[PDB]
Ligand binder design. Sequence first.
Ligand SMILES: C=C(C)[C@H]1CN[C@H](C(=O)O)[C@H]1CC(=O)O
Length: 258
Amino acid sequence: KTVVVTTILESPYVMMKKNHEMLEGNERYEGYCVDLAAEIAKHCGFKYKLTIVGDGKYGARDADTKIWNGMVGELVYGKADIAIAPLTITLVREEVIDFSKPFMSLGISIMIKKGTPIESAEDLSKQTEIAYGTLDSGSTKEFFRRSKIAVFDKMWTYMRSAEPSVFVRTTAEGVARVRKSKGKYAYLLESTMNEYIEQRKPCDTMKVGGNLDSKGYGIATPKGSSLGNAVNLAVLKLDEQGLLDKLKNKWWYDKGEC
Ligand SMILES: C=C(C)[C@H]1CN[C@H](C(=O)O)[C@H]1CC(=O)O
């Protein structure tokens, strides 16, 4: 009957419509992932309910209890049937849930306040005037923590014990710190979010340098789910038709402010 979809609020993937208080159910939300969910549902022929993950996390396994949290945990423990969000495809997550082909490509990137004399990862790792950090949890932080590359190992060694903490807890926090640090803070985040903010007033940030890696976001389903196959074929079809690009351009540029 009704497929239970777990997601999370993160602009411009899933946001509350300005008039949401007057709306109900699925109609309350808007965004790239909201449009994507509708497309996938239409293609696979299923009815569904969008729900916001309880703990507001993406997916990580606690080191003490070995229990998965976030949307990944909702799928592993049978709370939701599918997760449609900017959920990064990682080896650790791939071990416990299934991912469709990526619906969007991305790579860890650098966000600076316009005017900052930083152009790449090497630049940051060499100086100390301009501080830099990542989210206090998530795929990006983990990338630096386990990296074997000298430059990235150098950046992690710094970020690891920098004071005050160069880590932020949300994308908005990371952005504000950049906008408010007078060019003394660089925020390491996923290129997709970076490109998005760049099109947001007061248009004072920008992405610099190439991406530190290459990955993608995928629609996740619990392992053995008889939904996984259909969802993957739907993603492939929407991508072949150019709809995913059109969708990205819609929420990133057509609705841009800069
Ligand atoms: C917005 C958050 C916390 C997410 C989105 N994708 C990543 C993930 O799925 O881990 C996290 C970003 C990052 O790690 O920089």
